[PDB]
């Protein structure tokens, strides 16, 4: 059920530096000028993948090594771009993330407490349109469940969401990487 | 001679990605007579050519006041990195430093409650709205209101007030009419804090 | 030669009986070399004889700070009446007077809303009880709280903040532990105001 | 059904003055020194009348002449006298007042307002202990009912009370006089 993604350059945020390959992207230090466009994030760093999900089961993994804070999910293709909102399963989004290095959430409304006796150093996500569900695997751990969202419906299109994190702190420089599958 | 003042940043700044927070560094008086100044910007030690200056102005002390500006990136400044203005003239001998930085403080996350008007208040023609933060520090806050999206700009906002163990708190008024808050219609109070999770969050009131 | 301020009383103090409001008469300094200073008091201009002297005070730049102080009747503050300081002193040519009263302006009546917590908080072992206070003017207000006749010390009170209006509005936070509120006990909140009926009014908040 | 009254100067609060025959009552400019005995009002101008009621019906009047504040009524005789407190039916008290030149208030909790054509020189409070009743009447306009308080219960004894009002705008210093009747 893997699915090789790739990061879309329209979505991502203007200080996100995406890799030539588009398979990794880190939050950098200068504001790229770059266009304007309605499918881009203006306030924070975030970026979609380049896929359209209108059925199908799709998996695929992220690297988090080292890294202090990120956000990663699927959300609605209608989500909304521009300003500030929430991460919110009643919302578009169906995301879990790590900030404050070390504090786990899922991002249910309100927001759901995980608790990882083994921090994750990759992590795959996995989407079950027809069953309604999203869930989250601490590959680290073995493959074991960190997190499921389940009667997610789904009426539309579905984009995979990520997001490297805020650099509070100064130790959350690394990137995000997409795993080879 | 020339006395110099640096200045910080004003906090909503750091914290609204609308906003461009700038260091300001302020030079008073130079002589009409050796008017001319250098400014030299160091970011923790380290050498910066993108400041703005500005045209000096002239002081009914018959004296002149001069201003360089610098801009932040927030992610600095909220970092700690120190911001140096060194400013160089020759109605003085050796340059003068200064040093400037965001204060110490282990950071702490806002709690926001949003409450509804009281009974007794919806027998006037205007109703409030209130949004309780507590619990963080640094004092360093933005708050906001918006209904459907659009902003609702018809509120005011204490300023935070110290609690008993440290930490900071402070309450948003914000005046609606009665039939916007009667009709069921859903508002919210908005949060830009350096210790929430991607700096924001929001809270909704309705009836 | 010596110089003088005028102080007036601390605004609670004008409305708490249990307080007593004072006009402080401050002389700067004065000589080590002619120390002696004379106060003469007027309420509209009328001379009064019931003021405290304080003793005089060695201040590091070798100098003396002399105090008067005057304790003034509630109504009369409240009424506007000038309070006149008269100094006199040979490190000086001619007697100085100052005068001050009570600021101008339309008094307005205090609305007063207790607001409970919010239902999120009663995941929290303390919780947050609030009094929004509005519509004031001027800003000379006391406030506090009370549960079955005694008082509640643990609460903290925003300064007035000007409306849109030019009328104040402040919030109170009384702080308690949820197993008090949980029980159903009743805290009230308590306003000191000159534009209240008695100048004085409550409410309470129950679940 | 009128009764002869006589303020009760245990009750009184130390600013106010009392005549030698106990039937005025204004708020003076000095604090007189007196014992801080229990019956007193420490916080108000208000005074007590030295009759308690057990039973019966009773009527007086008082005069209020050219003042722009007062408070009138009975209460029990178990109200508190220390500190600050509302003149509330609810508390013990059953009394309508007048404040800030011209507004009329009934002591209903919440406080009832009074619209009144013909603003009072005289008014008159009828005691009815059976009926469980304390009503007020408009002396200058015939009589003409100001505000009746019903099913009031009443279990004990019952004091008339009063208070000359405070003297915010400077044109209160009349007092309350008991009419001769
Ligand atoms: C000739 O006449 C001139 C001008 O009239 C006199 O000038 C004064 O010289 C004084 C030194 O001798 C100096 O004293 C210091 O005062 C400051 C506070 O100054 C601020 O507030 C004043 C009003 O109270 C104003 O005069 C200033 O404008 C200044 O305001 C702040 O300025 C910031 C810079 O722009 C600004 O920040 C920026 O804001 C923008 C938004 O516009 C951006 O967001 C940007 O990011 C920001 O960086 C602030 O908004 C603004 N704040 C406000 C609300 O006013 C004081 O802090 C300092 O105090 C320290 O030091 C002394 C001793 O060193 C000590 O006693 C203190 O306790 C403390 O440690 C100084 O006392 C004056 O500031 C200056 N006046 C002006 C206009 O600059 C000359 O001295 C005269 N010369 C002679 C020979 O007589
Ligand atoms: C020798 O050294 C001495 C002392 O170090 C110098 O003293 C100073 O002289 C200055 C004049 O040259 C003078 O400047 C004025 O300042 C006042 C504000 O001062 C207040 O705050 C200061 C701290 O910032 C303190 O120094 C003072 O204590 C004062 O505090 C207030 O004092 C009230 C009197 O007690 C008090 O009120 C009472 O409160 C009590 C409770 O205790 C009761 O409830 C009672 O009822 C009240 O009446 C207040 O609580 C208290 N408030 C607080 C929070 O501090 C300033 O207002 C004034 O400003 C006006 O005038 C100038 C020009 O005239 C103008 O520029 C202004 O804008 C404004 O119009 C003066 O600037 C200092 O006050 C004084 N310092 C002290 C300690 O008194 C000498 O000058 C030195 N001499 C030489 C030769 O160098
Ligand atoms: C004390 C003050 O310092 C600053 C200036 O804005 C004013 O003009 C004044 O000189
Ligand atoms: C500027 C200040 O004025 C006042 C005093 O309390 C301080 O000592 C200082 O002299």
């Given at each position: 059920?893997?699915?090789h ?6 979505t ?15 939050l ?5 000028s770059?266009?304007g ?20 089961k ?6 988090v090594?080292?890294?202090?804070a990120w ?6 293709d209608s ?7 929430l ?10 993330w ?17 608790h ?12 079950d349109?027809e069953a309604?569900?999203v869930?989250?695997?601490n590959?680290?751990?073995?493959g ?6 389940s ?12 997001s490297?994190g805020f650099?509070?702190?100064?130790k ?6 997409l795993?080879?599958? | 001679?020339?006395?110099?003042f640096?200045?910080?940043?004003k906090?909503?700044?750091?914290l ?9 560094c ?10 001319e ?7 923790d ?16 002390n018959?004296?002149?006041?001069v ?7 927030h992610?600095?400044?909220?970092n ?40 007794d ?6 109703v ?5 933060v ?21 509120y ?5 007030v110290?609690?008993?163990?440290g ?9 609606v ?5 009667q ?20 809270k909704?009131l309705?009836?």
């Amino acid at each position: 059920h893997m699915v090789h993604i790739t990061l879309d350059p329209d979505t991502a945020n203007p200080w996100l530096i995406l890799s030539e390959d588009r398979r990794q992207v880190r939050l950098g230090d200068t504001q790229q000028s770059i266009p304007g466009n309605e499918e881009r994030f203006d306030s924070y760093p975030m970026v979609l993948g380049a896929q359209h999900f209108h059925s199908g089961k799709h998996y695929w993994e992220v690297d988090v090594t080292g890294k202090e804070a990120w956000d990663l999910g699927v959300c609605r293709d209608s989500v909304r771009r521009k300003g500030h909102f929430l991460l919110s399963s009643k919302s578009g989004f169906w995301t879990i993330w790590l900030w404050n290095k070390q504090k786990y959430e899922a991002g249910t409304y309100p927001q759901t407490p995980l608790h990882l006796q083994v921090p994750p150093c990759q992590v795959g996500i996995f989407l079950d349109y027809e069953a309604g569900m999203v869930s989250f695997y601490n590959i680290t751990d073995h493959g074991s469940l960190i997190y499921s969202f389940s009667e997610c419906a789904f009426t539309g299109p579905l984009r995979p969401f990520f997001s490297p994190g805020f650099n509070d702190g100064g130790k959350n420089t690394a990137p995000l990487t997409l795993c080879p599958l | 001679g020339p006395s110099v003042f640096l200045f910080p940043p004003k906090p909503k700044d750091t914290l609204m990605i609308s906003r461009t927070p700038e260091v300001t560094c302020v030079v008073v008086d130079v002589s009409h007579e050796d008017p001319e100044v250098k400014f030299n910007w160091y970011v923790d030690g380290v050498e910066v050519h993108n400041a703005k200056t500005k045209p000096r102005e002239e002081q009914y002390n018959s004296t002149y006041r001069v201003v360089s500006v610098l801009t932040v990136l927030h992610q600095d400044w909220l970092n700690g990195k120190e911001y140096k203005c060194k400013v160089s003239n020759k109605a003085l001998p050796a340059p003068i430093e200064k040093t400037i930085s965001k204060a110490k403080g282990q950071p702490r996350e806002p709690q926001v409650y949003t409450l509804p008007p009281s009974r007794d208040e919806l027998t006037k023609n205007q109703v409030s709205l209130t949004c309780l933060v507590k619990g963080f520090y640094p004092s360093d806050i933005a708050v906001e209101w918006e209904s459907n999206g659009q902003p609702e700009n018809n509120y005011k906002t204490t300023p935070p007030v110290l609690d008993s163990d440290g930490s900071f708190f402070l309450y948003s008024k914000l005046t609606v009419d009665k039939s916007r808050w009667q009709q069921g219609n859903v508002f919210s109070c908005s949060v830009m804090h350096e210790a929430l999770h991607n700096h924001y969050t929001q809270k909704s009131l309705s009836l």
